[PDB]
């Protein structure tokens, strides 16, 4: 009755490029969810299968330094961390 | 324009 969120973190464009980074989280329930990498949070929606989804974006500009997003959610015992690529 | 809802 709880649904594990699917995660996609990804650049809006492809080292110096002033880009925004999006965290796209789908297929989860209940809707309470915690997302972080300042980070702006889009407004939540849901889809005809009743499952929720959101987008988390914040500006950045990359280079060997690492980047990811951690998603806390009651479906998972431990937060899920997903690294860029 | 959304409908006004009744009670379940």
């Amino acid at each position: 009755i709880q649904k594990t969120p699917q995660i996609q973190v990804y650049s809006r464009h492809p080292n110096g490029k002033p880009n925004i980074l999006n965290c796209y989280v789908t297929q989860f329930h209940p809707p309470h969810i915690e997302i972080q990498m300042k980070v702006e949070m889009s407004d939540m929606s849901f889809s005809k299968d009743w499952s929720f989804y959101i987008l988390a974006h914040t500006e950045f500009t990359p280079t060997t330094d690492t980047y990811a997003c951690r998603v806390k959610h009651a479906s998972m015992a431990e937060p899920k961390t997903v690294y860029w690529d | 324009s959304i409908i006004v809802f009744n009670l379940v």
């Binding site: 329930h29 209940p30 849901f46 009743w50 | 324009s1 959304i2 006004v4 809802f5 379940v8």
Partner: protein, 274 residues
């Protein structure tokens, strides 16, 4: 083509953290155009597309007031449902609703929707006849029997055949020039060598709209129906969407493979080749 006007409602209770959170979100042809959210500064109905700003102050004032009534009403449904299911009064619970219509090209109703879910699962829905209900369990049957006695189906049928499609036609006239906007994808193939002696071709489609897209990889005229990694179409976060399909190929044999991009923006589908 067909068009739809559909409202996606959410009420989620926060025991101890105050009143339940309530929201209504409106879609025209599956594009968000209005939004209400109890958790804003002054909860107001807001336009979510530039072309909704053509409505005057009366509209927002009526929809804001209507939403506050629905909100108060869904706070009671949450208490009612907990009692029907005889659940503990400590946890958070959710109600969701899908409500609206789909109309054919003549502007007449094709389908109406009145779908309730409790805690992520089907609760009661209005059947296609617009006269009768499907309850998902015995709790939902109390609602069914009550709504049969109230004439709720008749009240919904009138709304979905009259009010709803009339508002959709109103919304279409203002938004059509924006909702038929089509952005064709921007395709390129990337290359990523891996151990051992095989390589990942990844076919990208970027900045396209609507999100309806199909991507294929092929060897000498055959759809490599797996396996071949596919990514759920995703928003770029600016009105456009992204998607890639990748396939693993032997070293040196890249040129025998072609990627194919199918999207309504493209006169001719794209063929790309490393």
């Amino acid at each position: 083509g067909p068009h739809s006007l559909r409202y996606f409602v959410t009420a989620v209770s926060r025991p101890g953290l105050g009143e339940p959170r309530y929201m209504e979100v409106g879609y025209v042809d599956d594009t968000e155009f209005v939004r209400f959210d109890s958790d804003a500064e002054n909860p107001r109905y807001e336009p979510r597309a530039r072309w909704m700003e053509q409505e005057g102050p009366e509209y927002w004032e009526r929809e804001t007031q209507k939403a506050k009534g629905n909100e108060q009403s869904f706070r009671v449904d949450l208490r009612t449902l907990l009692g029907y299911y005889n659940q503990s009064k400590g946890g958070s619970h959710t109600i969701q609703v899908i409500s609206g219509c789909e109309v054919g090209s003549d502007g007449r109703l094709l389908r109406g929707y009145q779908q309730y879910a409790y805690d992520g699962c089907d609760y009661i829905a209005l059947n296609e006849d617009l006269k009768t209900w499907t309850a998902a369990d015995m709790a939902a049957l109390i609602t069914k029997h009550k709504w049969e006695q109230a004439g709720e189906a008749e009240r919904l049928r009138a709304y979905l055949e009259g009010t709803c499609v009339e508002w959709l036609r109103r919304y279409l006239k203002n938004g059509n020039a924006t909702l038929l906007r089509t952005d064709s994808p921007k395709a390129h193939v990337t290359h990523h060598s891996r151990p051992e002696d095989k390589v990942t071709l990844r076919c990208w489609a970027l900045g396209f709209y609507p999100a309806d897209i199909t991507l294929t990889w092929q060897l000498n005229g055959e759809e490599l129906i797996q396996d071949m990694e596919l990514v759920e179409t995703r928003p770029a976060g600016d009105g456009t969407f992204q998607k890639w399909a990748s396939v693993v190929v032997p070293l040196g044999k890249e040129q025998y493979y072609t990627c194919h991009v199918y999207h309504q923006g493209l006169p001719e589908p794209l063929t790309l080749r490393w």
